[PDB]
Structure prediction request, 971 residues.
Amino acid sequence: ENLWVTVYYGVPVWKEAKTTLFCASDAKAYEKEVHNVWATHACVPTDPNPQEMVLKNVTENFNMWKNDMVDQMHEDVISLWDQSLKPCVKLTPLCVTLNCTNATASNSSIIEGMKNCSFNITTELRDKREKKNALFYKLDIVQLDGNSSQYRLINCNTSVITQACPKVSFDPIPIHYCAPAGYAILKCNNKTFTGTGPCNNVSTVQCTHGIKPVVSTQLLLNGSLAEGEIIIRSENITNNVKTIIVHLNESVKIECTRPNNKTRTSIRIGPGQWFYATGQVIGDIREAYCNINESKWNETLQRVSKKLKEYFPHKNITFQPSSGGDLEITTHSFNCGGEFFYCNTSSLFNRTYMANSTDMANSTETNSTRTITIHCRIKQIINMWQEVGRAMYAPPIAGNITCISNITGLLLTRDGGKNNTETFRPGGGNMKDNWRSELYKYKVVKIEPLGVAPTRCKRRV
Amino acid sequence: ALTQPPSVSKSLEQSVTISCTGTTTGNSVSWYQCHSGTAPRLLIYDVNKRPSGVSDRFSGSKSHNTASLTIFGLQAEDEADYYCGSYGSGGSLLFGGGTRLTVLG
Amino acid sequence: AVGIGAVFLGFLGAAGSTMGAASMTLTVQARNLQHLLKLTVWGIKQLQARVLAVERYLRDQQLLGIWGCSGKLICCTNVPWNSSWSNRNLSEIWDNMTWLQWDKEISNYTQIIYGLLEESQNQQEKNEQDLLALD
Amino acid sequence: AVGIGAVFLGFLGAAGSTMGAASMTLTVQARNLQHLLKLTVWGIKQLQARVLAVERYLRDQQLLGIWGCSGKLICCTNVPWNSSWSNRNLSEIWDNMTWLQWDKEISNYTQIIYGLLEESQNQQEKNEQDLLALD
Amino acid sequence: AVGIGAVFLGFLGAAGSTMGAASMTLTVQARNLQHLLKLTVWGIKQLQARVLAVERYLRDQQLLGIWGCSGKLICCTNVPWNSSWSNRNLSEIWDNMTWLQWDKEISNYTQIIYGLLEESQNQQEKNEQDLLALD
Ligand SMILES: *[C@@H]1O[C@H](CO)[C@@H](O[C@@H]2O[C@H](CO)[C@@H](O[C@@H]3O[C@H](CO[C@H]4O[C@H](CO)[C@@H](O)[C@H](O)[C@@H]4O)[C@@H](O)[C@H](O[C@H]4O[C@H](CO)[C@@H](O)[C@H](O)[C@@H]4O)[C@@H]3O)[C@H](O)[C@H]2NC(C)=O)[C@H](O)[C@H]1NC(C)=O
Ligand SMILES: *[C@@H]1O[C@H](CO)[C@@H](O[C@@H]2O[C@H](CO)[C@@H](O[C@@H]3O[C@H](CO)[C@@H](O[C@@H]4O[C@H](CO)[C@@H](O)[C@H](O)[C@H]4NC(C)=O)[C@H](O)[C@@H]3O)[C@H](O)[C@H]2NC(C)=O)[C@H](O)[C@H]1NC(C)=O
Ligand SMILES: *[C@@H]1O[C@H](CO)[C@@H](O[C@@H]2O[C@H](CO)[C@@H](O[C@@H]3O[C@H](CO)[C@@H](O)[C@H](O)[C@@H]3O)[C@H](O)[C@H]2NC(C)=O)[C@H](O)[C@H]1NC(C)=O
Ligand SMILES: *[C@@H]1O[C@H](CO)[C@@H](O[C@@H]2O[C@H](CO)[C@@H](O[C@@H]3O[C@H](CO)[C@@H](O)[C@H](O)[C@@H]3O)[C@H](O)[C@H]2NC(C)=O)[C@H](O)[C@H]1NC(C)=O
Ligand SMILES: *[C@@H]1O[C@H](CO)[C@@H](O[C@@H]2O[C@H](CO)[C@@H](O[C@@H]3O[C@H](CO)[C@@H](O)[C@H](O)[C@@H]3O)[C@H](O)[C@H]2NC(C)=O)[C@H](O)[C@H]1NC(C)=O
Ligand SMILES: *[C@@H]1O[C@H](CO)[C@@H](O[C@@H]2O[C@H](CO)[C@@H](O[C@@H]3O[C@H](CO)[C@@H](O)[C@H](O)[C@@H]3O)[C@H](O)[C@H]2NC(C)=O)[C@H](O)[C@H]1NC(C)=O
Ligand SMILES: *[C@@H]1O[C@H](CO)[C@@H](O[C@@H]2O[C@H](CO)[C@@H](O)[C@H](O)[C@H]2NC(C)=O)[C@H](O)[C@H]1NC(C)=O
Ligand SMILES: *[C@@H]1O[C@H](CO)[C@@H](O)[C@H](O)[C@H]1NC(C)=O
Ligand SMILES: *[C@@H]1O[C@H](CO)[C@@H](O)[C@H](O)[C@H]1NC(C)=O
Ligand SMILES: *[C@@H]1O[C@H](CO)[C@@H](O)[C@H](O)[C@H]1NC(C)=O
Prediction:
């Protein structure tokens, strides 16, 4: 019996294949008159089409980190910044000095950050430039002179100086990253949940369901929930330093808004230009005062330890505090309302909660809840996109900026090893690891519809 | 460009990063060593990738600002100096400011 | 209604499990047949997609064409296979392999095989026309 | 570029009435081959149809490939007209009926005829192995 | 697929190398195969051109079907060619001219040659068909 050759067309095969994606957006989040900015510009609309054609005989394998779309999740917003960059104002093109210790303010403000200044060595050396209120917001006062410092303008020695103004858009728009036909995205979803070995429930989708990606240093707030169970992933389990992703079947908040109500005192200094001294008098007790109901908080953590058991059998869990450097790593960062979050989260990740066969040594919430409170930082000049040397000033604003929302996962790292006492430090690490959340359910391929096999039959000749 | 730290410090057999942090608009990147003033030694042949010289203890890693070298198993050679090399602004070539590494303890 | 891997590529996206019967079923499966302003921009990329599908499909059919078959969603040759690329018994291939296994147990002999197909085709159709050529 | 014959392809208009003259000349019946910002929409919508018409034309080409009639304009295969099909007879069809009448007669049997083609083509392939299965 | 090598379909780049040589190059060139506003307006015209290229390619492919050829790139036919217009003999064609002079040697008679290809293709079915039509 011979082996001739034969060809087949329309046959089912798809390739593991890198490709790069367009973004689909809500075309009424932005609006018709707000031309010439990234979301109104190159990002296209959306028309959702879940169409999840189910698959016996699928057998694909996965790793969370083999994906390339993670890079697009760090890209894009540089164009949102650049298409919107406000210039250096005439008061600020050089390292001017400022003098204060108590605040330049209308009142004895009971807020630690508004230690406001005059401008002093200032362009013309003229009262019209100097006497203007340099509103402070804690992260200020770069030292110049060794005593009684005439503080340096902190932005003057980095490549970008720029301003946030209330007209300039920011919004967590629902976004989808997508690629044309013949390519397909495969979503994988066996309750035996994987992203790591084989899979057993799969179908194509034209794009992911929408996601609202925004940065954090500790807590995956407003993330997509898991279901049935908590889960953890961290690549080669012999590894110490490389990030552990913790993902939740329940959720809990962090109890503060952005409460610091302030006046609309912008100063129209320079030719069609501004400084936003928007501070003083109104709300001058309203520091961020963040708080913790231990019950639901500790419950989720102790549940997480009862999962960590599975990765570290018959030995007892513990935690250690987060890193310094930029105190964002010690705290948080996120934007809401143009205002940024920096309360002492590292105060929480603590005790030696036991994993012996135990009915104790796993709680502090006391059923009384205690409603504990923690010290908070603030910043008016922000590193507007992380790692990069850029800096931007942003105004404090009137009323309550209400974001106080819920957590669906943790950034986590191990701290070496010792006999029985396994332990971890929360947050920090690769800021790309935020986007690994949920995206593990998806990967992209190219269809390749033709092929060949041997056979026991021959063409006419 | 291309700014670098003057040094960083971690102890024997531990691990650390160096990165190059200036006008890193160029985005395929390489890294190099000099030690005791001898002829410079390569590390990274493109930003995540290395040949036969030190094929385990070093590692290459991607970021837009921090063109990043990551190092583990720190030993008595790690008193050397280390440099980034992006490709340049078209038909052009660059070096980093260097980092004289200082393994402590 | 019409078959669908993509909107007409790969006439079902779901594989019929097994390189035997599914191949026969594929032939029968081929046989059975503001808001508005930025929406007028959304009406671009799906157009690009349908055009690209045609473009790919016609490039593909051209490769079949030079191999001296067209349509013929299975086609036979006069090219041999000398008992040495896995040699799995032919029922066991048909019954136990998806193409999404032949993709790994076989494959990347592809360029050679495409060569064999083309070279044999041209040389064969020249043979008959050369044997006919005398006058 | 060019005008229209009901459709930008298929070219109905030389209806011929009698199928005789029409079939006996079928070759020539194809062998003859805001200022303006809203011109976006008044290109988009007929472009969609224009593309999807080519996709319809490709559905047809798929069937023609399936019957082993690729690129042919008149074609036939093995299958007999085996007696029970209406008895209208050769010398008593074309000269006294029209294509629209012939459909209005024949509409019952369509899928059955198509299946008979499918089967016969698929048999005709392997039937040659009755001579060629020498190994 | 890929960025344009100066020319799309038709793939012109062996231009005015010898015709004899061109057959190899050709077979190989087969074998391988305002922010958003007015720039999205423009995003129709080239796509419309992309469609017109497909329209031309398919319109012109249909002609090969009438000649009984399938994109099988060296189709041949016992219409004789019979020397007497440019007369060169074989090598004296293929080693001398470009195809961009073979047109200036011969256009015109083309309009009869298409007919020779039609009626000869109809003969190559008729001359078998009538011998089967003995019963
Ligand atoms: C995580 O999840 C939380 C909770 O779901 C989200 O917080 C909600 O965000 C939306 C959108 O900002 C809020 O809804 C809108 O509130 C406006 C007032 O908002 C204040 O707070 C926001 C920050 O959320 C500031 O930007 C803003 O300046 C204010 O300080 C309303 O104006 C909106 O419309 C309503 O009021 C107007 C009149 O003002 C009416 O004309 C409208 O008809 C309508 O009634 C709108 O309601 C929502 O209030 C927030 N809730 C909470 C509890 O904070 C987070 O945004 C989300 N993401 C992150 C990273 O935390
Ligand atoms: C973490 O925080 C987020 C907010 O930051 C929580 O988001 C949403 O929260 C609600 C309450 O927890 C969830 O429950 C559903 O809410 C919708 C909308 O109110 C309800 O739909 C409406 O139901 C009524 C009655 O059946 C019906 O008449 C309406 O027609 C119907 N639709 C609308 C548009 O009103 C629904 O019944 C539930 O009550 C949401 O599911 C949740 N949404 C999202 C996107 O997260 C989140 O729940 C919270 N998670 C945890 C674990 O704390
Ligand atoms: C701190 O967090 C705990 C949970 O860890 C909160 O306790 C839960 O609070 C809800 C809302 O009050 C309780 O539900 C209500 O219960 C009553 C009966 O007690 C019922 O009539 C209502 O319809 C509603 O279901 C829930 O039972 C309670 N759980 C427990 C175990 O006590 C607590 O309220 C939080 N406290 C603060 C100050 O944040
Ligand atoms: C293509 O056909 C070749 C045989 O001609 C198949 O095997 C080849 O095997 C060697 C040794 O495994 C591969 O080298 C390297 O192997 C290690 C360990 O498996 C792997 O980590 C490296 O990435 C690398 O593959 C060699 O590359 C491989 N050839 C190719 C072209 O893949 C091979 O299985 C067939 N591959 C496919 C995709 O059809
Ligand atoms: C197949 O051909 C038939 C006839 O051309 C199409 O019409 C259907 O024909 C039957 C049989 O004549 C009708 O049933 C009954 O027929 C008797 C005798 O003619 C009559 O006395 C009854 O009143 C009744 O009509 C049937 O009703 C008729 N259908 C309709 C909607 O009128 C049939 O549609 C063709 N089918 C296909 C798929 O081509
Ligand atoms: C292909 O066919 C044409 C005839 O259809 C062949 O001859 C060309 O015909 C035109 C029109 O008669 C000639 O132009 C005219 O020439 C006369 C006399 O020189 C002049 O008085 C008119 O003003 C007009 O220009 C054209 O010269 C002629 N070309 C040649 C080269 O003869 C043509 O030759 C045929 N092609 C070949 C290669 O045989
Ligand atoms: C509360 O926040 C402070 C930082 O404001 C944390 O302690 C300091 O952290 C910095 C940065 O890591 C170190 O340089 C200081 O040496 C730390 N001080 C001390 C006394 O350790 C502090 O750990 C947070 N938590 C609590 C419970 O206070
Ligand atoms: C056939 O034999 C050749 C050497 O003659 C070898 O390269 C090839 O791998 C063999 N396998 C098949 C199935 O042709
Ligand atoms: C052809 O033969 C079948 C049985 O094989 C019979 O049912 C049918 O009536 C016959 N005639 C036609 C024209 O189908
Ligand atoms: C071939 O024969 C025709 C007449 O049948 C004649 O007109 C023509 O000149 C000849 N030569 C060529 C190259 O066609």
Observations:
- The two ends of chain D are 56 Å apart (CA to CA).
- The pocket of ligand 4 is lined by residues C 107-108 (CB under 6 Å).
- Chain D touches chain A at residues 126, 128-129, 132-133, 135 (CB under 8 Å).
